[PDB]
Amino acid sequence: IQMRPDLKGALLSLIEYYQWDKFAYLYDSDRGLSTLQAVLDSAAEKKWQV
Amino acid sequence: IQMRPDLKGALLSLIEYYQWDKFAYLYDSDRGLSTLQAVLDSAAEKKWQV
């Protein structure tokens, strides 16, 4: 019973609102890279230079 | 006692050999992401577009 909501989708919509294209993604090897894969897989569909 | 040698240094030295600057890194989550962290952390040290 994962009480925490899936944050992957939330952050993906915010970067789309500000219309970013070239940023830096500082990640810690702690909470998992599930939010890192989500933006790395989407780094090809919507182009980004992350 | 890990029999398999570390590949992280080897691949980085070959990419530096072919002198690549923009490539595609198709990784599978199966064998881990230790090599994925090696290219991502070295993506900034040499300024690549992965």
UniProtKB/Swiss-Prot annotation, chains A, B:
Induction: Down-regulated in the pyramidal cell layer of CA1 in the hippocampus by global ischemia. Detected in forebrain. Detected in dendrites of neuronal cells. Expressed in the pyramidal cell layers of CA1 and CA3 and in the granule cell layer of the dentate gyrus. It is found in: Cell membrane; Postsynaptic cell membrane; Postsynaptic density membrane. Palmitoylated. Depalmitoylated upon L-glutamate stimulation. Ubiquitinated by RNF167, leading to its degradation. Belongs to the glutamate-gated ion channel (TC 1.A.10.1) family. GRIA2 subfamily. The postsynaptic actions of L-glutamate are mediated by a variety of receptors that are named according to their selective agonists. This receptor binds AMPA (quisqualate) > L-glutamate > kainate. Ionotropic glutamate receptor that functions as a ligand-gated cation channel, gated by L-glutamate and glutamatergic agonists such as alpha-amino-3-hydroxy-5-methyl-4-isoxazolepropionic acid (AMPA), quisqualic acid, and kainic acid. L-glutamate acts as an excitatory neurotransmitter at many synapses in the central nervous system and plays an important role in fast excitatory synaptic transmission. The M4 transmembrane segment mediates tetramerization and is required for cell surface expression. Homotetramer or heterotetramer of pore-forming glutamate receptor subunits. Tetramers may be formed by the dimerization of dimers. May interact with MPP4. Forms a ternary complex with GRIP1 and CSPG4. Interacts with ATAD1 in an ATP-dependent manner. ATAD1-catalyzed ATP hydrolysis disrupts binding to ATAD1 and to GRIP1 and leads to AMPAR complex disassembly. Interacts with GRIP2. Interacts with GRIP1. Interacts with NSF via its C-terminus. Interacts with CACNG2, PICK1 and GRIP2. Interacts with GRIA1 and SYNDIG1. Part of a complex containing GRIA2, NSF and NAPA and/or NAPB. This is Glutamate receptor 2. The lineage of its organism: Eukaryota, Metazoa, Chordata, Craniata, Vertebrata. The gene is Gria2.
